[PDB]
Amino acid sequence: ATQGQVITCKAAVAYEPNKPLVIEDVQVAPPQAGEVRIKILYTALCHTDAYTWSGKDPEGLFPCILGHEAAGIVESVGEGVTEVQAGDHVIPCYQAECRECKFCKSGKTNLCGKVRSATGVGIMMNDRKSRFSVNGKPIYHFMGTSTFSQYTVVHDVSVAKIDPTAPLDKVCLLGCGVPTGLGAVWNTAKVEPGSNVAIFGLGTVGLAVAEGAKTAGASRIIGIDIDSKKYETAKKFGVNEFVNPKDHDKPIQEVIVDLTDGGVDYSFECIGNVSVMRAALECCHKGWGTSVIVGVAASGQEISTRPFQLVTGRVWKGTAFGGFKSRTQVPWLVEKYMNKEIKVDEYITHNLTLGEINKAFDLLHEGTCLRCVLDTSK
Amino acid sequence: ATQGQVITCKAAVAYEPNKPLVIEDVQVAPPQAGEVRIKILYTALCHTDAYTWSGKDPEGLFPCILGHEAAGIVESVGEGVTEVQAGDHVIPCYQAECRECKFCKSGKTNLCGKVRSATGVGIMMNDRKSRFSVNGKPIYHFMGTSTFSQYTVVHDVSVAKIDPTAPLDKVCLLGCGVPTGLGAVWNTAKVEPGSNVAIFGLGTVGLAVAEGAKTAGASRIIGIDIDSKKYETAKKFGVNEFVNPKDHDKPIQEVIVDLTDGGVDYSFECIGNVSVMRAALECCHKGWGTSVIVGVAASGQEISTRPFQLVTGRVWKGTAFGGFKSRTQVPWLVEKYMNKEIKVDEYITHNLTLGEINKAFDLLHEGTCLRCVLDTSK
Ligand SMILES: NC(=O)C1=CN([C@@H]2O[C@H](COP(=O)(O)OP(=O)(O)OC[C@H]3O[C@@H](n4cnc5c(N)ncnc54)[C@H](O)[C@@H]3O)[C@@H](O)[C@H]2O)C=CC1
Ligand SMILES: NC(=O)C1=CN([C@@H]2O[C@H](COP(=O)(O)OP(=O)(O)OC[C@H]3O[C@@H](n4cnc5c(N)ncnc54)[C@H](O)[C@@H]3O)[C@@H](O)[C@H]2O)C=CC1
Ligand SMILES: [Zn+2]
Ligand SMILES: [Zn+2]
Ligand SMILES: [Zn+2]
Ligand SMILES: [Zn+2]
């Protein structure tokens, strides 16, 4: 048994903004009530990790174990945990689903407040302390997940139990960008067959929106990116027209309006840039157009438009994890992937190891990844 | 000019139930106010035609010119007609869209009563007489369309103006089965991505439902037909599992429930058989399942179920022309076909001429057609 015992293991610790992550031996405490200790086998990285690592995250706390896109196998569970057990295959999710709060009970949102008072400050609810340490001193959790490690401890309300035959080096991506993108189409916008759609930003999120739109039956799927190399790549995900704002003097919204004779039925902003968010709203069609903000803007940044845009029938909205309830629906997305109904594999451009995580981050930084997946054994 | 003049032309006249249609020379009167005379180039036939021809239609009136799935070119228009003109390419529709009645104004239905008091009894609204005759004696219109003719006269509220570059030997199918099927999914049911669907009856309507479901993002698309040869054909339209009721002693609803562990999210009955309609309702999932009746049952036939089926969350509904507004949306479907977003060609199994219409009906009778299209020039 490792159960009830401290586990020493490899993990990538971020000690300071912008410094290379150091691969330490760390102590992972056993799970307390309501907690789940997971053997993480594969973890993906994304710009959300890098953002905090670069010291730009006002909620960032050092030293910490980053990582929030993973899949693994439950090693043990704490007192009272019943939905997973040792041996279950799981995806830890930064977005909880407690099923007991007024948000979960509402039936009108996927947001759940249950553990965010602890996970927002790098600790666990049960004792308001961390489960990670080196040389007797605590290392903060990150986003309730901390998946840059061979083992992590997470709240049971954050653990999705998945099909035990799913490939763990692929379905690690179903914890972040892919569900956000697909559900922005399916849940937040509810795009109807024949809709025309604009997608601003063709990274992983944007490409998942394009797949979502394609699956929902959209007609014109117009991608907008400042990097024209993204178009060739985006075609397999369903993007079927492309505009680079740099090729035009006019604001991009006017360009899209001209291209569609009035605007799109739905737009999605998958960058996190307030000016593009405004453009995405303003390129929607009068009367019925809807824009969904998926991008996460920096602190203090504001979106603007003229109220006539909304008075004349446009709707402004946004999405958090595609509107998916994590514990209930991440398993459902895994099922759809196993049935070849959603892409996952095609988003993984590189496969490295946890040991080479610093190299993964260099790949991320240079725009070379869609998703880079890390094997935590080496 | 043929305009303002009577036109003599070929047309297939049905004089008596079950007798071979006779290809006469007929007189087509010029259009009066609100009417449109159309040079019909291609017309498809379907079981709706045959039903009336076989004398089973209580609204059937003889002698008559059958046919309701066509495409052509406007020859002339009557007083006051402004939405089409001579030379426009058109699809005459059995379902009007006047835009002025309480049904059109409702925003809650595609049914329009405007001309059905005349078209239901084989005549025109303007003068309550027919525009067809042989040897001075009147021939009734059928379904406001009468497309088994080189020329017909229809109400302007029934004429969809379409893209002038569309192939008229294909888009004749967008006046009946294909929109009914696609819109049963898109408009009546509003099937969401990932839904499981059952389709009862894999003719043209059923196959259009399958295409609709596929386009909407459905997961399991289960086809049910008493002819197992329909499965191979149905696969290209999106059917991905198949059940023949004959291979099972249990009622088909129990079979589907077993296959899906509880039932489908949506079912569609595309036959017109009250017992299968009940089966389609009862194979829907508790809590949220919805069945859509597309099939048109015989007079006096009734559907039945136990109320607990509905009390426990199933919804029973039906569709008329897929919920599409004809004049506004048939042009839209043509646009989608031209953009390769909906199939049309694949439903056309044979191409004959109006002269061989009796042979077309034999093909129809033996189950050999999905859709048989007729060139009216020969
Ligand atoms: N709402 C939510 O729950 C979630 C939001 N996100 C957010 O989604 C956004 C995208 O994430 P990823 O796809 O991983 O990022 P990414 O960095 O891989 O992709 C960004 C893309 O936007 C393009 N771009 C940058 N500036 C542009 C401009 N001015 N106009 C057009 N294109 C431009 C880049 O060329 C790049 O292709 C981020 O803000 C991220 O925080 C991510 C996950 C969940
Ligand atoms: N609601 C509306 O607006 C419209 C309704 N319709 C109706 O849709 C229905 C289907 O039309 P089409 O596809 O042209 O007919 P079809 O005759 O081409 O297809 C009927 C299919 O049902 C199958 N079938 C017959 N009995 C069966 C059973 N007991 N169980 C399972 N399968 C069975 C046959 O094998 C055949 O494949 C008809 O009732 C027609 O009147 C057609 C157009 C519009
Ligand atoms: Zn991520
Ligand atoms: Zn909750
Ligand atoms: Zn028909
Ligand atoms: Zn009307």
CSV table of N, CA and C in Angstrom, one decimal, chain B residues 135-197:
chain,number,residue,atom,x,y,z
B,135,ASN,N,-61.1,19.3,-74.3
B,135,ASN,CA,-62.3,19.3,-75.1
B,135,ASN,C,-63.4,20.1,-74.5
B,136,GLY,N,-63.0,21.3,-73.9
B,136,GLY,CA,-63.9,22.2,-73.2
B,136,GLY,C,-64.4,21.8,-71.8
B,137,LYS,N,-64.0,20.7,-71.3
B,137,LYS,CA,-64.5,20.3,-69.9
B,137,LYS,C,-63.3,20.3,-68.9
B,138,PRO,N,-63.6,20.8,-67.7
B,138,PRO,CA,-62.6,21.1,-66.6
B,138,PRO,C,-62.0,19.9,-66.0
B,139,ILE,N,-60.7,20.0,-65.7
B,139,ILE,CA,-59.9,19.0,-65.0
B,139,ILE,C,-59.4,19.7,-63.7
B,140,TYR,N,-59.5,18.9,-62.6
B,140,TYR,CA,-59.3,19.5,-61.4
B,140,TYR,C,-57.8,19.6,-61.1
B,141,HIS,N,-57.4,20.7,-60.4
B,141,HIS,CA,-56.0,20.8,-59.9
B,141,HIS,C,-55.8,19.9,-58.7
B,142,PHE,N,-54.6,19.6,-58.3
B,142,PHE,CA,-54.3,18.7,-57.2
B,142,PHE,C,-53.3,19.4,-56.3
B,143,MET,N,-53.7,19.5,-55.0
B,143,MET,CA,-52.7,20.1,-54.0
B,143,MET,C,-52.2,21.5,-54.3
B,144,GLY,N,-53.0,22.3,-55.1
B,144,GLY,CA,-52.6,23.6,-55.5
B,144,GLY,C,-51.4,23.7,-56.5
B,145,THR,N,-51.0,22.5,-56.9
B,145,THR,CA,-49.7,22.4,-57.7
B,145,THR,C,-49.9,21.8,-59.1
B,146,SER,N,-50.5,20.6,-59.2
B,146,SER,CA,-50.7,19.9,-60.5
B,146,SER,C,-49.5,19.9,-61.4
B,147,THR,N,-48.4,19.2,-61.0
B,147,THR,CA,-47.2,19.3,-61.7
B,147,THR,C,-46.9,18.3,-62.7
B,148,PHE,N,-47.9,17.4,-63.0
B,148,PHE,CA,-47.7,16.3,-64.0
B,148,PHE,C,-48.2,16.9,-65.4
B,149,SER,N,-47.5,17.9,-65.8
B,149,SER,CA,-47.9,18.7,-66.9
B,149,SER,C,-46.7,19.6,-67.3
B,150,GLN,N,-46.7,20.0,-68.6
B,150,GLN,CA,-45.7,20.9,-69.1
B,150,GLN,C,-45.9,22.3,-68.6
B,151,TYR,N,-47.1,22.6,-68.2
B,151,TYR,CA,-47.5,23.9,-67.6
B,151,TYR,C,-48.6,23.7,-66.6
B,152,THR,N,-48.5,24.5,-65.5
B,152,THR,CA,-49.5,24.6,-64.5
B,152,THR,C,-49.7,26.0,-64.1
B,153,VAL,N,-50.8,26.2,-63.4
B,153,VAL,CA,-51.1,27.5,-62.8
B,153,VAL,C,-51.4,27.3,-61.3
B,154,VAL,N,-50.7,28.2,-60.5
B,154,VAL,CA,-50.7,28.0,-59.1
B,154,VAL,C,-50.8,29.4,-58.5
B,155,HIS,N,-51.2,29.4,-57.2
B,155,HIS,CA,-51.3,30.7,-56.5
B,155,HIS,C,-50.0,31.3,-56.2
B,156,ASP,N,-49.8,32.6,-56.3
B,156,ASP,CA,-48.5,33.2,-56.1
B,156,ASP,C,-48.0,33.0,-54.7
B,157,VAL,N,-48.9,32.9,-53.7
B,157,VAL,CA,-48.5,32.6,-52.3
B,157,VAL,C,-47.9,31.1,-52.2
B,158,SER,N,-48.0,30.3,-53.2
B,158,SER,CA,-47.4,29.0,-53.2
B,158,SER,C,-46.1,28.8,-54.0
B,159,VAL,N,-45.5,29.9,-54.6
B,159,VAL,CA,-44.4,29.8,-55.5
B,159,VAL,C,-43.2,30.3,-54.8
B,160,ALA,N,-42.2,29.5,-54.7
B,160,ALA,CA,-40.9,29.8,-54.1
B,160,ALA,C,-40.0,30.2,-55.3
B,161,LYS,N,-39.4,31.4,-55.2
B,161,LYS,CA,-38.4,31.8,-56.2
B,161,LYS,C,-37.1,31.4,-55.8
B,162,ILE,N,-36.4,30.7,-56.6
B,162,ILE,CA,-35.1,30.0,-56.3
B,162,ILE,C,-33.9,30.6,-57.1
B,163,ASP,N,-32.7,30.2,-56.7
B,163,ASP,CA,-31.5,30.5,-57.4
B,163,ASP,C,-31.6,30.1,-58.8
B,164,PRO,N,-31.4,31.0,-59.8
B,164,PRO,CA,-31.6,30.6,-61.2
B,164,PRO,C,-30.5,29.7,-61.8
B,165,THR,N,-29.4,29.4,-61.1
B,165,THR,CA,-28.5,28.4,-61.5
B,165,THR,C,-28.7,27.0,-61.0
B,166,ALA,N,-29.7,26.8,-60.2
B,166,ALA,CA,-29.9,25.5,-59.6
B,166,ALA,C,-30.3,24.5,-60.7
B,167,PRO,N,-29.8,23.2,-60.6
B,167,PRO,CA,-30.4,22.2,-61.5
B,167,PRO,C,-31.9,21.8,-61.2
B,168,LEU,N,-32.7,22.1,-62.2
B,168,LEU,CA,-34.2,21.9,-62.0
B,168,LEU,C,-34.6,20.4,-61.9
B,169,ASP,N,-33.7,19.5,-62.3
B,169,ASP,CA,-34.0,18.1,-62.3
B,169,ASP,C,-33.6,17.5,-61.0
B,170,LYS,N,-33.0,18.3,-60.1
B,170,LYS,CA,-32.7,17.8,-58.8
B,170,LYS,C,-33.6,18.6,-57.8
B,171,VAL,N,-33.7,19.9,-57.9
B,171,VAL,CA,-34.3,20.7,-56.8
B,171,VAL,C,-35.8,20.5,-56.8
B,172,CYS,N,-36.4,19.8,-57.8
B,172,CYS,CA,-37.8,19.5,-57.7
B,172,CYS,C,-38.2,18.7,-56.5
B,173,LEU,N,-37.2,18.0,-55.8
B,173,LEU,CA,-37.4,17.2,-54.6
B,173,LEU,C,-37.5,18.1,-53.4
B,174,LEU,N,-37.1,19.4,-53.5
B,174,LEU,CA,-37.2,20.3,-52.3
B,174,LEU,C,-38.7,20.9,-52.1
B,175,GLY,N,-39.6,20.4,-52.9
B,175,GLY,CA,-41.0,20.7,-52.6
B,175,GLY,C,-41.8,19.8,-51.7
B,176,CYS,N,-41.3,18.7,-51.3
B,176,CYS,CA,-42.0,17.6,-50.5
B,176,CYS,C,-41.2,16.9,-49.4
B,177,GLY,N,-40.6,15.7,-49.8
B,177,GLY,CA,-40.1,14.8,-48.8
B,177,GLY,C,-38.8,15.3,-48.1
B,178,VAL,N,-37.9,15.8,-48.8
B,178,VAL,CA,-36.6,16.2,-48.2
B,178,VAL,C,-36.7,17.3,-47.2
B,179,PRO,N,-37.4,18.4,-47.5
B,179,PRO,CA,-37.6,19.5,-46.4
B,179,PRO,C,-38.4,18.9,-45.2
B,180,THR,N,-39.3,18.0,-45.4
B,180,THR,CA,-40.2,17.5,-44.4
B,180,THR,C,-39.3,16.8,-43.4
B,181,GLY,N,-38.4,16.0,-44.0
B,181,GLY,CA,-37.5,15.2,-43.2
B,181,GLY,C,-36.4,16.0,-42.5
B,182,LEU,N,-35.8,16.9,-43.2
B,182,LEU,CA,-34.7,17.7,-42.6
B,182,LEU,C,-35.4,18.6,-41.5
B,183,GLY,N,-36.5,19.3,-41.8
B,183,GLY,CA,-37.1,20.2,-40.9
B,183,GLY,C,-37.7,19.5,-39.7
B,184,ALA,N,-38.2,18.2,-39.8
B,184,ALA,CA,-38.6,17.5,-38.7
B,184,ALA,C,-37.5,17.4,-37.6
B,185,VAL,N,-36.3,17.4,-38.1
B,185,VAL,CA,-35.1,17.4,-37.2
B,185,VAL,C,-34.8,18.8,-36.7
B,186,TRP,N,-34.7,19.7,-37.7
B,186,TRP,CA,-34.2,21.0,-37.4
B,186,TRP,C,-35.1,22.0,-36.7
B,187,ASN,N,-36.4,21.9,-37.2
B,187,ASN,CA,-37.4,22.9,-36.8
B,187,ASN,C,-38.4,22.3,-35.7
B,188,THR,N,-38.9,21.1,-36.0
B,188,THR,CA,-40.0,20.6,-35.1
B,188,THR,C,-39.3,20.0,-33.8
B,189,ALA,N,-38.4,19.1,-33.9
B,189,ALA,CA,-37.7,18.5,-32.8
B,189,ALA,C,-36.6,19.4,-32.2
B,190,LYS,N,-35.8,20.0,-33.1
B,190,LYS,CA,-34.6,20.8,-32.7
B,190,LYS,C,-33.6,19.9,-32.1
B,191,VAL,N,-33.2,18.8,-32.8
B,191,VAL,CA,-32.3,17.8,-32.2
B,191,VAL,C,-30.9,18.5,-32.0
B,192,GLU,N,-30.4,18.2,-30.8
B,192,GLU,CA,-29.1,18.7,-30.3
B,192,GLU,C,-28.0,17.8,-30.6
B,193,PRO,N,-26.8,18.3,-30.8
B,193,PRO,CA,-25.6,17.5,-30.9
B,193,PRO,C,-25.5,16.4,-29.8
B,194,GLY,N,-25.2,15.2,-30.2
B,194,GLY,CA,-25.1,14.1,-29.3
B,194,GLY,C,-26.4,13.4,-29.0
B,195,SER,N,-27.5,13.8,-29.5
B,195,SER,CA,-28.8,13.1,-29.3
B,195,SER,C,-28.7,11.7,-30.0
B,196,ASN,N,-29.4,10.8,-29.4
B,196,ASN,CA,-29.8,9.5,-30.0
B,196,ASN,C,-31.2,9.6,-30.6
B,197,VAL,N,-31.3,9.1,-31.8
B,197,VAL,CA,-32.5,9.2,-32.6
B,197,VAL,C,-33.0,7.9,-33.1
